[model samples]
Target: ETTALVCDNGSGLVKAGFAGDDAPRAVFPSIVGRPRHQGVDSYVGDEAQSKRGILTLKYPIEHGIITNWDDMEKIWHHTFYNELRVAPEEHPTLLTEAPLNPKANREKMTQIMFETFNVPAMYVAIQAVLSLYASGRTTGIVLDSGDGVTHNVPIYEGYALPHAIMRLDLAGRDLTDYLMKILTERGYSFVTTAEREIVRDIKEKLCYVALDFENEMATAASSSSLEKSYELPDGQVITIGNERFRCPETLFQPSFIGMESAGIHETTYNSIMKCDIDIRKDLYANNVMSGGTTMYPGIADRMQKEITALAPSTMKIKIIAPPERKYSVWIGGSILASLSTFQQMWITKQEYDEAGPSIVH
Candidate 1:
C-alpha cells in the first residue's frame, strides 16, 4: 500500500491528511507560539491559540511565503508527526504552493523535505492548479482569496498562463482587520490577541458579501434585518449592523478601504483578456472560485453579476464555488496523490542528491 501524504500549507491555515481521504484530517493555523520564560517548549497550531495568555504567537508564512524557516520546520514536524501520526521518512509527500511562489522558496522547500526530514519523494503542486482540479477541470480561470493575498490564475489544458496572472494584496485578513477597526471606532476595544480571535470568529459567522453594496448599506443602516448580535467570551452581546456588509464590501470595491487596485471581478476580466483571445471564451465559461474568502455568502452571485456586467454581452460566465472551497487545494492534492499514475511525478530523494536543490525547477 502507498502511504502518501498531502498538505495544503496555506497562510491562514494548514490542511493536511493522508492520500485518498475525502478531506483533510487536520486543519489548524499556520502559527507557532513560544513562551517568554525558559524550560518551556513552543506550541503549534490550535494549542498556540489556546495558550493565548502565556505564549506569544509567530507566523511561519508572511504573504504566502515561508519567511521563518525555523518556525516552518517546527510546524511541518508537528503536522507530520503529532497531527497525522506519520513518519516523514516512511512516506512520499505532496505539498501545495502559491501560484507565484519564488524560485528560491521552491529550492528551500526541496532542501527541507529531503535534507531535513529525509522524505523518500516529494512534489509541489501549485494551489491554483489544484483548485481547478478540485472543480474537476484542467482549464479555467481561478480566483483564490485567502488570508494574506488574492490571485487570479488562468489555466489552459492543465498548465497556467503566467502572463495572465493577477494578484491583489486584499483578502480575508484585511476583512478581519477592517471589522476590528470598525468595532474599535464604535467604542468596542479588543485588548488581547485572544479577543482579536473572537472578532475573527464574529466576522466569519456574521459577515457576507453584499449583492448590492449601496442598497444593502442603506437598508442595513435603516432596517433591523441586517442586525445580528454576537456574544464575546466575556459574555457581552454586541449588535452588528451595516458593518457586516461594509467590511466584506472591500473585496468588490477595494476603494472602500483606500486601496487603489481593481476589484476581484475587474482583475478576473483583465486576467482573461491578457490570455489568447481563442481561450478567453473558455476561460469565461469556466471561472473557478476557491479559498477561505470565497466561503462568504453571496460571493459567487456577486462575482457572477460583476463579471457578467464587464464581459461582452454574448459571453456566458459560469462561476463554480465548491462547498469545500477552503480545502479545495488540499482535496485536489489528495486526489492527485491517490492516482497510481501520479507515482512517476514525484521527485525522488535520489534525484535531489544528484541534481541538488535545482531538482525542483
Candidate 2:
C-alpha cells in the first residue's frame, strides 16, 4: 500500500503529514495561536516562539493529550491541508499519540480524521513505542522525557510492557521554572512571567549536566570571576554568576529544585521492576532515550550514570540518544510507513469513505 501520511504529536509540538526517502515533508507546532483578529491571529513554529502578549496561544493539547476538541480540529485542518501541503484525499493517514490516551479523545480524533479530511482510514499508535520499533531493539527501556512530560516505557521482545510504564509531569518546562526561581533568588530584578521564555533559551544553550554535581556546584559557588557573560536577545549581557546554572541535574535530582525529588533513577528502576523480576542481562542491552528534552547536551550520560547505579552492579548499561530526539517519533513513524508489513497500517480512502470515522485501529 502507498502510504498517505504519518503523524507524530510530541508534548512540545506536532510533526506530521508526509515523509519520503529524504525526510519529513511537513512539520508544525502542536500549538494554535488565537489572535484578536480572525485570520491574523494564527501562528506556529518559529513564528509562535516566545509569543507573550501578542496572541492567545492555545496549546489545545497538553502533556500529549488533546485539551480542546474544537481548537484541535482547526489546527489539524489548517496544518495538513495548508501548511503541510498534503490533501487528505490523496493518501492514507497515520497518527502518533500518547501511550494509553483517554478513550474519548481517541474517539474524537478518529472522527476528525475521517470527517474533516475524508481520510479513508487511520493508524494510531504510541509515539514512544514507535521510537523503540525504529531502534530495531528486541528488548530495551524506552524513556521519553519531552517538553511537557517524562515517560518511562519498557519494551520486551518488541511488545510494550504497559503495566511497567510511568509518566511524570516534570520535564523541560519544569526545568525552566526551576531556573526562573534561581534567577529570582539571585536578585536578577528583571525576572517576570514573560521572562520565562528568555530564561529557558539561556538554560538550553548554557546549562550542562555535571558529572560530579557537588564539585561543579562548589566551583560555581566559590568563583568570583565575571569572565563569562551571556548576551540576551535584547542586546543586554548578564554576568555569569559563580552559581553554575543547574538545569540538567533536576531530572536526576528534583530536590535541587526545592521539591521532593523522585530522581530519574528511582522512577526508571521502578519501571523495569514492575515488569520483569528475573532481570535478564540482555533485557537492557539497548536502552533508548528519545524525546525533545532528552536532547539536552548531557542527558544520555547523566541518565546512564544514574540508571546504572540503580541496576545490579554486574549489569552493563548502554544509554543511546537518537539524532534529532525531538523528531524521532516522526522519523521512526516514517520508517515504519516505508516497510511493507507496516504500510498496511494505513487507512484506505475506500474504507474511510465507506466506514467513516469508525475506521480506526
Evaluated with lDDT, which candidate comes out highest?
Answer: 1
lDDT of 1 by residue, 152-197 (tens): 9999999899989998989888999899988888788865677778
Assess each prediction's global lDDT (C-alpha) against the native: 0.90, 0.71
Error of 2 at 151 (Å): 0.3
Point to the candidate with the largest TM-score.
1
Write candidate 2's Cα lDDT for 1-361 as tens digits: 3456777766566776565533566665666666745435466654555563566777777887878877787677766767667677666777877876866667678878877777756777778887887777657788887778888888777667888888877888888777777767777744664577678777776776767678776777776541257787778877645333466688887777676848776787788878767644554566788776777676677778887878888887888787776677777777777678876766665676676555564
* Every model's TM-score: 0.96, 0.88
Clashing pairs in 2: 4-92, 14-30, 120-352, 121-347, 220-242
Q: Which window of 10 residues has the lowest lDDT sum in candidate 1?
A: 33-42
lDDT, model 1, position 145: 86
Per-residue lDDT, model 2, residue 324, is: 70
Reference-based TM-score, model 1: 0.96
